[PDB]
Amino acid sequence: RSYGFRPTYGVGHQPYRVVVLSFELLHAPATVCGPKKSTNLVKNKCVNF
Amino acid sequence: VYADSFVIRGNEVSQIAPGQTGNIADYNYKLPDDFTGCVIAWNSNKLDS
Amino acid sequence: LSRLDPPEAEVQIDRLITGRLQSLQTYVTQQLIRAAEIRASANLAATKM
Amino acid sequence: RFASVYAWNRKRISNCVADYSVLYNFAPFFAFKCYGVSPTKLNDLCFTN
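Above: the input entities. Below: the structure tokens describing the complete assembly.
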């Protein structure tokens, strides 16, 4: 059944378009990520890997 | 990363939350208890009314 | 688990588990202290025997 | 007929089946906020008053 979505309806019945972004926060591999880039590592230096 | 998309009532978006109760949360779209991600909703009266 | 919804009863279950574990750790500590006392008493009794 | 916020009307309900499914079924009922209980379990619980 439908609500009708008539213009006389208020915010309680006006249509809202909804999107649900479901993420998986595991760091096993990497699909999408933020834009960032830096230099290479060092073999025997204290680095924030 | 997955993205679900739909259109509902304006205030019915109150039911779009992990493990809530209601018509949508039980018979149309149910989120898991351990859901993590984002939910966005915006007006669509200019299009869907 | 029959009055409240899963996503809002998880915190209550967690608090109950925390309370029942805190009430059991103290019991285990008391049992250890009394077991050490009984061990000392039994060593003294064996020495006297 | 609904009274004002002061001298509010109060009605006792007993000796009947409480089918809450017809309560959140109404469209204008946007606000449905329960404390100490979830809407999914209202049809499964029992009340003494």
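Note for the figure: The radius of gyration of chain B is 12 Å.
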